[PDB]
Amino acid sequence: VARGWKRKCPLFGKGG
């Protein structure tokens, strides 16, 4: 749910 804050610059928006 918080992938956007995984490590540094994750793929919060894998879609587009």
SS3 14: coil
Please name the amino acid found at residue 7: R
Listed in sequence order, the DSSP H helices in the chain are none
Cα separations (Å) of 5 from 1, 10, 15, 16? 9, 7, 17, 17
Task: State which approach was used to obtain the coordinates.
Answer: NMR
